[PDB]
Amino acid sequence: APEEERIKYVITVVEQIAKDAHRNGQEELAKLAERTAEEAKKATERGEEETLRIVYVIVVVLQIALEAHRNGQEELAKLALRTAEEAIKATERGEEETLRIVYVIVVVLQIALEAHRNGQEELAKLALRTAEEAIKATERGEEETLRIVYVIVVVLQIALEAHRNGQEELAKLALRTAEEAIKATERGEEETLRIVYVIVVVLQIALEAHRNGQEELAKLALRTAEEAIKATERGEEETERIVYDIVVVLQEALEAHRNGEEERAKKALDEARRRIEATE
């Protein structure tokens, strides 16, 4: 399993740095390596669970399209097919986004492995703390995607219940809400891909500069990628605030639909749609 061998090598290298730091006496490097190696384990475990929920979402959206076609409602089946296609495009973008983030971590840890092996302990500590911030930022993106997945799953359940209850207006309005949530996630993936590629370029500068002996250039480039990751985290914190404001609206739509007040549930999903379109 190539998806399993690359992760094992990443964790093995960092754990090897922690053992070498302890025998040499650098506990700051040891505690930084041990914590970074653990953050990678949690990012891998959280990534595996994130992949399963996304597959589950795609099955549900496709399941609705096949069911709505058999029940006669064709306009809802086309809307679910359009929603499913964008969910697939969103997942494929996340795959390339994940593939570039993994390369980010590998390059940084390669800098840390070479810096610690060549004696530059201050450069090795700088690389490991940048690697940890990159993993922490990735975990914050994984948790945020899971929050987005929950928004989609709740909306998909409303559309299925409304479809089986003959409430096509609420079913179409829900799928449209789930549709915009996927479009908003796509636009966030596009802007993130532009940032991650920019960070890859800067990290390749530090790796080559260290191998060629430009230590001052290597530290400044590695330092530049650190604040780029930190600046990206601060911007993502604001996006998390809006999503929580959307989840509260979906809970109002859930409670209005289960209690029969369908007019309040439609107004709630409509207000949530305007907020989603404004996010990105």
Residue numbers in the entry: 0 to 279
The publication says:
Here, inspired by natural and re-engineered protein–peptide systems, we set out to design proteins made out of repeating units that bind peptides with repeating sequences, with a one-to-one correspondence between the repeat units of the protein and those of the peptide. The proteins are hyperstable and bind to four to six tandem repeats of their tripeptide targets with nanomolar to picomolar affinities in vitro and in living cells.
Crystal structures reveal repeating interactions between protein and peptide interactions as designed, including ladders of hydrogen bonds from protein side chains to peptide backbones.
